[PDB]
Amino acid sequence: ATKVVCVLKGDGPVQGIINFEQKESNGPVKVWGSIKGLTEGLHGFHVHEFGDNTAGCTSAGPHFNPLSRKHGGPKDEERHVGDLGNVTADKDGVADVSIEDSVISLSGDHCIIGRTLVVHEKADDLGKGGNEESTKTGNAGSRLACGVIGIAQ
Amino acid sequence: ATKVVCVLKGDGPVQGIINFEQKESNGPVKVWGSIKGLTEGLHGFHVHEFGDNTAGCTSAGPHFNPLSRKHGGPKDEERHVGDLGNVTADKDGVADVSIEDSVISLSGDHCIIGRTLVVHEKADDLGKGGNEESTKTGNAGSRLACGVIGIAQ
Numbered sequence A, B: 001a002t003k004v005v006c007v008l009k010g011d012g013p014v015q016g017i018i019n020f021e022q023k024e025s026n027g028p029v030k031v032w033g034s035i036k037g038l039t040e041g042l043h044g045f046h047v048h049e050f051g052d053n054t055a056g057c058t059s060a061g062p063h064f065n066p067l068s069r070k071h072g073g074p075k076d077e078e079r080h081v082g083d084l085g086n087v088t089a090d091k092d093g094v095a096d097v098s099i100e101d102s103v104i105s106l107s108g109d110h111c112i113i114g115r116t117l118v119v120h121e122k123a124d125d126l127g128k129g130g131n132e133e134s135t136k137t138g139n140a141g142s143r144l145a146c147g148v149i150g151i152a153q
């Protein structure tokens, strides 16, 4: 009953369309779609705080973290709201995205609408990386593609 | 105290950055920025319903109209929430945008976050055009550039 969408654009082309659906405001969000142009392997996949693409993906700021927590994986209690882990690209450079998440929302204080979805250069270590940056960014590196998260029909 | 931003891009030369700021929860919204690549004259300037850029600006759908009103100009009672009138480009193809609007909002049912800002091919006749489409789209024609409206820092 809430549908939300994001068009990811970045150089490669790294490009993708990610859909979000939430049947009830109390409920999990299904996240699905496709990203192409990626290198094989894991790519960190996050909601960042600002829906600001003024100077590209860097304008989006840090991971969306309304609760002031440390970085983690989506299955961790200690995570940023925006922590959606990794998408995995094959040799064809395509990541088939199929995520269900109970922490992001399409309503309320954890709402992701108007924020930025980013697919990153490297793997997110899901905060298990044992350097300082693991607990902040997951060491997922640069921002390959992003988009502002918008209301869908 | 709330700041929102939109990067306008499309298939041709039209591009811009539009900022929105709302000092008080239900107060007026200041809208300002710059759009270049335009023909001289008026270009319809609207918030459209969907923050969906899947297939370009057409995916944004009709004018944002939560109150089921007819199309009008920003200074009309009978308007869509998304009706921000026209921006005016000079011979250089630059429109300097400076708008204050009391109907849009950055919170609540009138909130434009997650929706799409669109700059159009032609003038919006502000519903005074005396054909049927005047009362729906303002006859502003095709969508030159658009962006999803995002939360800013």
Ligand SMILES: *[Se]c1ccccc1C(=O)NCc1ccccc1
Residues within 6 Å of the ligand: A002, A003, A106, A107, A108, A109, A111, A112, A113, A151
């Ligand atoms: Se997303 C969010 C955050 C705080 C309070 C309300 C909401 C919400 O209801 N989103 C607005 C919306 C409106 C129409 C379609 C989808 C989303």
Ligand SMILES: *[Se]c1ccccc1C(=O)NCc1ccccc1
Residues within 6 Å of the ligand: A108, A111, A113, A114, B002, B106, B107, B108, B111, B112, B113, B114, B151
């Ligand atoms: Se205003 C609006 C419209 C659609 C979806 C969500 C929201 C919203 O209010 N989100 C919460 C928000 C907005 C601006 C700054 C911080 C948080």
Ligand SMILES: [Zn+2]
Residues within 6 Å of the ligand: A046, A063, A070, A071, A072, A079, A080, A082, A083, A136, A137, A138
């Ligand atoms: Zn994080």
Ligand SMILES: [Zn+2]
Residues within 6 Å of the ligand: B046, B063, B070, B071, B072, B079, B080, B082, B083, B136, B137, B138
């Ligand atoms: Zn209208």
